[PDB]
Amino acid sequence: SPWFGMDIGGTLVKLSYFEPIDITAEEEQEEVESLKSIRKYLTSNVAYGSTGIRDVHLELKDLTLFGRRGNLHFIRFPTQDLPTFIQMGRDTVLCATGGGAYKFEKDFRTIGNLHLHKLDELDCLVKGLLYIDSVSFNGQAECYYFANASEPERCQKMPFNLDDPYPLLVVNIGSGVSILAVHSKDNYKRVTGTSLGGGTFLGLCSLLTGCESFEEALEMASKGDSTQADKLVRDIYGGDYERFGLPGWAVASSFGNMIYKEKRESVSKEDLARATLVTITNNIGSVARMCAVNEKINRVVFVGNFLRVNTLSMKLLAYALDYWSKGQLKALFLEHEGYFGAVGALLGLPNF
Amino acid sequence: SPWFGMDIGGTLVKLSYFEPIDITAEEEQEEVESLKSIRKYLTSNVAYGSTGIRDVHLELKDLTLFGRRGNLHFIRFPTQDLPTFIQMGRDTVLCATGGGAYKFEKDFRTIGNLHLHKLDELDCLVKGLLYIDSVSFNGQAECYYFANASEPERCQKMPFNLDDPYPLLVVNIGSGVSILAVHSKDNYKRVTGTSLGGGTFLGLCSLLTGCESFEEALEMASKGDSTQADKLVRDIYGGDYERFGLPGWAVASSFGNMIYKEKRESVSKEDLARATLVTITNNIGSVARMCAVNEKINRVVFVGNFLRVNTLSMKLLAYALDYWSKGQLKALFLEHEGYFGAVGALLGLPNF
Ligand SMILES: Nc1ncnc2c1ncn2[C@@H]1O[C@H](COP(=O)(O)OP(=O)(O)NP(=O)(O)O)[C@@H](O)[C@H]1O
Ligand SMILES: Nc1ncnc2c1ncn2[C@@H]1O[C@H](COP(=O)(O)OP(=O)(O)NP(=O)(O)O)[C@@H](O)[C@H]1O
Ligand SMILES: CN(C)c1ccc(CC(=O)N2CCN(c3ccc(Cl)nn3)CC2)cc1
Ligand SMILES: CN(C)c1ccc(CC(=O)N2CCN(c3ccc(Cl)nn3)CC2)cc1
Ligand SMILES: [Mg+2]
Ligand SMILES: [Mg+2]
């Protein structure tokens, strides 16, 4: 049986696949042609069907896992296309997490003799995050931060050491947001969550701009001016609000300029896309900051696919967390953002 | 000079006016006809121009203030129409607060010999809130809560005593949101704020539905089903997420069903209005809860005009704060929601 872990989320399915690279001549002879065709199909293609994608740049090479050497692959596709995935399979032990492990349990069981083992979506997240950082990203740091996030002529990605990762606040930005406090490898809790997450960005952006993909939404936002839609402190005060240290550039009311009909008539789709991105990102940062102060944790790591190919939100989080915490909190990021649950699920294989 | 206090916000101007009712025959003889016409104009009209409104139901009758007996009146109009207000005046000591006291300082000074005294928008809020509760609402409680907010066959408005109001978390929902921790009459601090406030509701609702007023937005929301736009826990898990006590009805991703084109094509304007209201209200509740836990305050009072004629948001806040805090926090409301800054400004008159 191939070694898979699967995280079936509200929006995306993430799949981690361990490809053994120490196959003997005798082991290849014992390989059924269905398994061999699966391994060939996955390792010789980077697009699967019309919506599946292998993130080749994330591959971990020559990893030792369960006493075998191999490559760890990272694959994603929309949860909407899970029926195609299951039908493809209908032509084996599956460790699965995310809400879809429960919602689609009966569908996975239409694969004859398949053993489905449902694992918790946040236990899997913590285990996979700790594992990937422990093995490194092909010798490079898995964790990074933006140094000097306040001065743009200096702001640059730099590695961060998590060899002693505790305590740690983990902010998982998926369709919605879960916030975890991790005190040890066996001691973690879900602090809270917010429903203003990546699905809010994508859904509102699609309603407001007619964009048809996450990538298009980001491209629109990169060209926009959020201050055409947002009301700033200086729009209300004429300057800073000095008494409480609020600079004139801070947003006082997200989309607040859109109460005026003439402004709604002049705002561009790109402005609205950027305002949606800024609104969602700032809110996540502020909730993360409040949770960090409550949990007395100063390292906040942001994961989930809202931040995939999304440097704008990462830099906004890095700047905002540093600025509003007066330097007490640091925003951290991980190279394998969206895949930690899928890896943690795969790591549950020995217990079955 | 007439006794006024003014709070010039990003969206609305609030005006508190003390009408003396113990005028002697000699005092009426000393009254200049301009002052008499001002008093007559304000007390004989409930609509002023096309956009000014006197909230007659809020009037405090036979109040003793600065050694005089009178009626305290509450008047509002859009900040966009402040030029009309100032031009009307151009045909006197003004205690003013809100950002507009700074932004429009020079405009108020076009009134010859007018002394403008700018006061802080949150100092004025605390002073006015404490004052109005102290004098009562014509013998009735100023503060109320929703008893049994979890069972709708029981949920009802009931009075709440604030005779010892400390400590108190004050959540001011205006264009944006300010959160204050009040430990004593002279000891309060702004904990944080969020830009996802009443202007976000109104601006997003106008973009999404084409509504042209706050009242129309609420009417649309009252007819809508937010679950047509929002993705719920049960949409992701097929039921509750039992491990973390998340019920299937909780919103997992606000507007998260709007990532699907077919759902965007079937959602109604009313559904979108209600989703906007729910999204903004739940986020404010959650931020308030996190702040209350951090400040170790269990009484959270919500003010500002986002909640004016907005029973849906008040009941959502009452239910949500009680449910998610497992009964540790209580949502409180005040009858004179939007006017506390204007009253606090008026109360600053003796110091000038
Ligand atoms: N190709 C993509 N398609 C859709 N959304 C994308 C894509 N790439 C990035 N995103 C963003 O990533 C978010 C989903 O992140 P992800 O961490 O995979 O969540 P999920 O696991 O599917 N949802 P959840 O059930 O809440 O844990 C979406 O809401 C988008 O903001
Ligand atoms: N007649 C109205 N016109 C506009 N907005 C209204 C009206 N009635 C209620 N609202 C709501 O009330 C909010 C403004 O509340 P308010 O407390 O008066 O804020 P403000 O003081 O003008 N703004 P701020 O500078 O942030 O303190 C708007 O964002 C709407 O959500
Ligand atoms: C990823 N996934 C399954 C997921 C993610 C996010 C959520 C939202 C969430 O966690 N909550 C709890 C806190 N909450 C409020 C609301 C009001 C208050 Cl007054 N307090 N809390 C809002 C809903 C749910 C599920
Ligand atoms: C009423 N009026 C003048 C007003 C109201 C609301 C605001 C917003 C606000 O208070 N802030 C501070 C906190 N903030 C963040 C953001 C990111 C992080 Cl990581 N942390 N905090 C956001 C902006 C400003 C002014
Ligand atoms: Mg997920
Ligand atoms: Mg205000």
Q: Report the C-alpha gap between A231 and A251 in whole angstroms.
A: 6
Instruction: Say how many C-beta atoms besides its own lie within 10 A of residue B21's C-beta.
Output: 12
Q: Report the C-alpha gap between A234 and A253 in whole angstroms.
A: 11
- The single residue listed with the structure tokens 């077919």 is B262
Let me know: does A115 contact A108? Beta carbons within 8 Å: no
CA of A308 to the centre of ligand 1 (A): 9
Let me know: does A175 contact B231? Beta carbons within 8 Å: yes
Verify whether ligand 3 is closer than 6 Å to residue B250 (CB atom): yes
| Domain extents in chain B | 1-140+339-352, 141-224+268-338, 225-267
The two structure tokens encoding residue B211: 């509504």
Sign of the C-alpha dihedral, residues B234, B238, B244, B245?
positive
Interface check B233 vs A, CB under 8 A = yes
Q: Where are the beta strands (DSSP E) in chain B?
A: 3-8, 12-20, 47-48, 52-54, 60-65, 68-78, 93-97, 115-118, 143-147, 156-159, 168-173, 177-184, 187-194, 231-232, 251-253, 299-303, 330-334
Sign of the C-alpha dihedral, residues A95, A99, A100, A105?
positive
Q: Report the C-alpha gap between B210 and A264 in whole angstroms.
A: 10
Q: Which of B192, B203, B290 sits opposite A192 (nearest CB)?
A: B290
Atom 1 in ligand 2: residue holding the nearest Cα:
B214
CA B85 to chain CA mean position, Å: 22
Q: Within 13 A of B256's CA, how many CA atoms are on the CB side?
A: 30
> Of the residues A30, A33, A121, A212, which is catalytic?
A121
Ligand 1 atom with least separation from CA of A199? 29
Enter the DSSP assignment of A137. Answer: B
- Non-local CB neighbours of A234 within 8 Å, separated by 6+ positions: A240, A248, A249
Q: Helices A198-209 and A214-223: crossing angle, nearest 10°?
A: 70
- CB contact burial B244-259 (16+ within 10 A = b; e otherwise): eebebebbbbbbbbbb
Verify whether ligand 3 is closer than 6 Å to residue B291 (CB atom): no
* Helix locations, chain A, DSSP H: 25-29, 33-44, 82-89, 99-103, 105-108, 121-135, 198-209, 214-223, 233-237, 261-266, 269-295, 311-324, 340-347
Q: Report the C-alpha gap between B53 and B14 in whole angstroms.
A: 10
Interface check B237 vs A, CB under 8 A = yes
* Helix locations, B90-213, DSSP H: 99-103, 105-108, 121-135, 198-209
Test site for ligand 2: of B8, B11, B334, most ligand atoms within 8 A of the Cβ = B11
Residues of chain A positioned with their CB less than 8 A from the CB of B261: 206, 212
Searching chain B, which residue's CA lies closest to the CA of residue A178?
B252
Q: Which ligand is nearest to the CA of B10?
A: 2
Q: What is the DSSP string of A158-171?
A: EE---SS--SEEEE
Test site for ligand 1: of A6, A8, A11, A343, most ligand atoms within 8 A of the Cβ = A11
Q: A11, A196, A206, A265: best mutation site toward chain B, by most B Cβ within 10 Å?
A: A196
Interface check A16 vs B, CB under 8 A = no
Let me know: does B127 contact B97? Beta carbons within 8 Å: no
Interface check A241 vs B, CB under 8 A = yes
Enter the DSSP assignment of B92. Answer: -
Q: Report the C-alpha gap between A85 and A13 in whole angstroms.
A: 10
Among B68, B55, B70, smallest CA distance to B21 is for B70
Instruction: Say how many C-beta atoms besides its own lie within 10 A of residue B308's C-beta.
Output: 17
Interface check B272 vs A, CB under 8 A = yes
Among B100, B97, B72, B73, smallest CA distance to B86 is for B100
Task: Write down the number of H helices and E strands in chain B.
Answer: 13, 17
Q: Report the C-alpha gap between B115 and B213 in whole angstroms.
A: 34
Structural method: X-ray
Let me know: does A29 contact A49? Beta carbons within 8 Å: no
H/E element, B27: helix B25-29
CA of A349 to the centre of ligand 2 (A): 55
Q: Report the C-alpha gap between A37 and B286 in whole angstroms.
A: 50
Residues recorded for chain A: 352
Instruction: Say how many C-beta atoms besides its own lie within 10 A of residue A187's C-beta.
Output: 11
Residues of chain A by 3-state class (helix, strand, coil), percent to 5: 45, 25, 30
Among A126, A200, A214, smallest CA distance to A165 is for A126
Distances in Å between the alpha carbon of B286 and those of A27, A33, B230, B321, B337? 56, 54, 17, 8, 20
- The single residue listed with the structure tokens 């440097």 is A311
Q: Report the C-alpha gap between B239 and A222 in whole angstroms.
A: 38
**Which are the residues after which chain B is interrupted (C to N > 2.5 Å)?**
91
Let me know: does B66 contact B89? Beta carbons within 8 Å: no
The two structure tokens encoding residue A235: 């729009």
Q: What is the DSSP string of B132-150?
A: HHHH-BTTB-SEEEEETTT
The two structure tokens encoding residue B296: 């170790």
Q: Report the C-alpha gap between A42 and A71 in whole angstroms.
A: 12
Q: Report the C-alpha gap between A13 and B241 in whole angstroms.
A: 18
The two structure tokens encoding residue A1: 């049986």
Cα diameter, chain A: 78
